[PDB]
Amino acid sequence: AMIKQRTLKNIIRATGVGLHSGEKVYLTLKPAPVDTGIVFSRTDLDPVVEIPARAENVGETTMSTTLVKGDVKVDTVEHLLSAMAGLGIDNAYVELSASEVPIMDGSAGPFVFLIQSAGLQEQEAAKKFIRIKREVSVEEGDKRAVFVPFDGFKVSFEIDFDHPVFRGRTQQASVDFSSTSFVKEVSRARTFGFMRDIEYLRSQNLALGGSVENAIVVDENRVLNEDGLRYEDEFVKHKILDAIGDLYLLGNSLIGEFRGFKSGHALNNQLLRTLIADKDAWEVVTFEDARTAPISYMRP
Ligand SMILES: C[C@@H](O)[C@H](NC(=O)c1ccc(C#Cc2ccccc2)cc1)C(=O)NO
Ligand SMILES: [Zn+2]
């Protein structure tokens, strides 16, 4: 059995608010033909502006990952793309009635549930993977992001906060998707912010849609959310979720390993751009026989 490209079986809709804009937004996920990739569409505009979710269309990366075409933007794509990558969706149209993707509960959980509710459709074309053949790294100050050849898909991440809440083994995590489920162990990890940083963002008219219902708020000594964390290491697992979404801007599932040290959307995008430019470090591969493949996907 060939590892096939996947799309959605049915259209599905969601309503929410943009984390940074605070704007109400309607999201529609639609099936798409083979080799379309993930394509965002601003349906509030006339004509409709389509922006493929590709590294070349990445705009500002100071807070969230943004896609740009001309002066048309699609903000905060990373959690939705993380859900797409996690469920192996190759092709889909993502329609939005506003510039920013809804934040939902701040994780990829509501998206993974909406996608699986609609169901997946295997398509009549081989799924294309980007296989890391050589190591590629990028650094900036003490931040680092690396691609390493690896027979499968693995993400390691380490955060470094000199803070009472961020001590012990909860500051690093590695997820090997051959034995670990993206859905159970990464997808529910919510976005987070430190109270002083969030205050700064609010003073700059950013984080307008943020609340304890869609973000973990940390002050100088504790988690302010009354109901607590979903994972003991929720923060570093959210950084893993971000990296998976940002890596999906390559346009294809990866066969390799990512390692991040204090990395964020900007350095993740720099890593993709360096990888793409270094064509000796990667190749496109397919699996006409699923038994020889190092990556496996759930039933559609
Ligand atoms: C973890 C970070 O890398 C980032 N998240 C943020 O930058 C961020 C920004 C603002 C808020 C917020 C908020 C808020 C506003 C008012 C009241 C309570 C929370 C949360 C996370 C992120 O998840 N990018 O995808
Ligand atoms: Zn995030």
Is there an atom of ligand 1 within 6 Å of 207 CB?
Answer: yes
- The CATH number of whichever domain residue 232 belongs to comes to 3.30.1700.10
> Does residue 215 have its Cβ closer than 6 Å to ligand 1?
yes
Q: From ligand 1's centre to the CA of 50, what distance in Å? A: 26
Q: What resolution in Å is listed for this PDB structure?
A: 1.8
Same domain, 56 and 98: yes
The experimental technique used to determine this model is: X-ray
Phi-psi region of 275 (alpha: psi -120 to 50; beta: other; left: phi over 0): alpha
Phi, psi values for residue 246, rounded to 5°: -65, -40
> Considering 75, 110, 128, which residue would you say is the last residue of a domain?
128
Q: Is 16 in the pocket of ligand 1 (CB under 6 A)?
A: no
Atom of ligand 1 nearest to the CA of 264: 3
Same domain assignment for residues 236 and 115: no
CATH classification at residue 7: 3.30.230.20
Domain C-terminal end among 128, 143, 177: 128
Q: Reduce the secondary structure of the chain to three states and give it as a string.
A: CCCEEEEECCCEEEEEEECCCCCEEEEEEECCCCCCCEEEEECCCCCCEEEECCHHHECCCCCCCCEEECCEEEECCHHHHHHHHHCCCCCEEEEECCCECECCCCCCHHHHHHHHHHCEEEEEEECCEEEECCCEEEEECCEEEEEECCCCEEEEEECCCCCCCCCHHHHEEEEECCCCCHHHHCCCCCCEEEHHHHHHHHHCCCCCCCCCCCCEEECCCCECCCCCCCCCCHHHHHHHHHHHHHHHHHCCEEEEEEEEECCCHHHHHHHHHHHHHCHHHEEEECCCCHHHCCCCCCCC
Domain housing 74: 1-128
Rounded to the nearest whole angstrom, what is the distance from the C-alpha of residue 19 to the centroid of ligand 1? 7
| Same domain assignment for residues 121 and 135 | no
CA-nearest residue for atom 3, ligand 1, is: 264
Residues 74 and 135 in one domain: no
Residues 72 and 164 in one domain: no
Q: How far apart are CA 179 and CA 177, in angstroms?
A: 5
**Is residue 248 a contact partner of residue 82, using CB atoms and an 8 Å limit?**
yes
From 67, 95, 128, the end of a domain falls on 128
* Residue 20 known to be catalytic: no
Q: Is the CB of 251 under 6 A from ligand 1?
A: no
| Separation of CA 70 and ligand 2 centre (Å) | 25
Q: Which of 265, 269, 270, 272 is catalytic?
A: 265
Q: Are residues 50 and 82 in the same domain?
A: yes
Are 52 and 95 in a shared domain? yes
Q: Are residues 182 and 299 in the same domain?
A: yes
Q: Does 159 share its domain with 94?
A: no
Domains held by the chain: number: 2
Q: 205 with 232, same domain? A: yes
The residue nearest atom 8 of ligand 1, judged by CA position, is: 193
CA of 235 to the centre of ligand 2 (A): 10
Q: Are residues 158 and 172 in the same domain?
A: yes
203/240 same-domain check = yes
